[PDB]
């Protein structure tokens, strides 16, 4: 037992480890999506910067959970990081949509995790989730919903002009 | 009676009080429109900022009349600020059309306030309107006209691409 | 149903919309209170500047709730903004006492909007309330508590001298 | 007849010349009032600085009318500047009440000089009055109204303490 540990239940330790892997997973989805738009037959340079920025942000989230695990006396346990479901992401509107489906599963995971932290009476783990992850997911999800909408209204994906002008008037 | 009152007819005092409610009403409409474009199925961020600017200007027109009422020795008498007509504004073109209708209705009320003040041989009240309101209405009305014309000519509302480009390139 | 809505109960949607009305009503009371100390027969410049600031900060309180509704996928429905209880607030001490009542009123709504968010297991909404409204009302209520206490111990409202000196020294 | 005179009635010529006298008389009252608070047995430094400013701004009010007469082709005819009603204005509150009377007096003349310019269809003279004298008197009369109200609610003139504190805090 760790000398710094206090009020940190074993089940939150495991649920922090699991959230670490999901956050790494998401960073790797975003990496995958980013270099898809770097492709010379997709070629939406700001879609690329976007998802690459998100990718780095998501690994930033994973490192913040690993720091916390150590602050609370928990022990990190890492697992394989599954390859993304896709190798090709089809179009910009399509890519925005999987990102939105992705942040809503990261969100469901945090929400279930905050729920556990409430049952196990850990207010420090609860504020940690609240400050650094909860509004962040709410913002992310609102952002991606805005993008999907403008893309649909412009004419994407059957219009390449739509994804071209969006690629630069919104993500530039 | 007020120690400062002078050539300030009670009809004026009442019409100023009504004008204050009209400006507050307008401000409330513009607030409702502003946040209609904030929402995730609309996502026209500069329409939302345009109208939030108009909401704050109208609120500031109201407060100016309240200063004047107290300036001339009248007494402020606030009414309920009634709920705007629409909760959903359909589109950017349509929001712009309602805004035109509104500033033109505010102008007509503002013009009636002026006919009154002439009838009452109140010259200070006349110059107050001339300086701080009449040209404002003429300018506001002209601007929304321009905006209507351009939106129709770009193919709105049936073009989703028109409102989006109009958002980037006229309101940003 | 909205593409960003996740874990955002119908009940909470309605409660926010209501808190929006309330924050708008409070901005109006303060507006009404503000221009009463501008009267030539009351003449408290700093009391007036005080409530105009409070009024404007209550408007921002409402716009922030309007933003949140759209972030969470909820749907703004506005309401008549009913006129404030008074058109004549008697004295600076009476006016401050009304605000103390008014702010404890809004505290009430928020605490119940929070219990409701506890009931519906919405931690994001909860910390949103925790971070942006709760300590503000605790501060706002303590600020007015101090003001009311000072005016009483000075001789207000019988001493008009008390209110003149408060106006320059605590609000200048 | 003057080479620049155009649409400038004999009647208006005479009315301006009269308003010139009046503005000069008001500068003299204020002058007289000013050096009464300099007395070693009254001793209100800021009351004194107050009326000396008002006196000087009334002189500029007269010189501006002198300028206008020559712009319009009219012909200045000056008059005795009669001595002010008092040589002893009793107290700061009484002095402020006299100014409120005096400024409502000049408001009177201007409003009638304006009706006259309406009667003679002289829009230039009208807007000249609108722009440079009307809102100044509305401001001047509201300023003194506030001052009178504050001194009364403080205890003036019975409390010499009231007038000492007004002198530093509203006029310093
Ligand atoms: Fe992200
Ligand atoms: Fe994340
Ligand atoms: Fe307006
Ligand atoms: Fe406007
Ligand atoms: Fe407040
Ligand atoms: Fe509030
Ligand atoms: Fe003092
Ligand atoms: Fe003056
Ligand atoms: Fe003058």
Residue numbers in the entry:
A (entry chain B), B (entry chain A), C (entry chain C), D (entry chain C): 5 to 176
Question: What did the original publication write about this model?
Answer:
In order to achieve the proof‐of‐concept objectives, we chose a 24‐mer human H‐chain ferritin (HuHF) nanocage as starting materials; subsequently its original Asp residues nearby the C3 symmetry axes were mutated into Phe, and the resulting mutant is referred to as 3FF. One ferritin molecule consists of six C2 rotation axes, four C3 rotation axes, and three C4 rotation axes. Here, by a combination of the multiple, symmetric interaction sites on the outer surface of protein nanocages and the tunable features of phenylalanine‐phenylalanine interactions, a protein engineering approach is reported to construct a variety of superstructures with shape anisotropy, including 3D cubic, 2D hexagonal layered, and 1D rod‐like crystalline protein nanocage arrays by using one single protein building block.
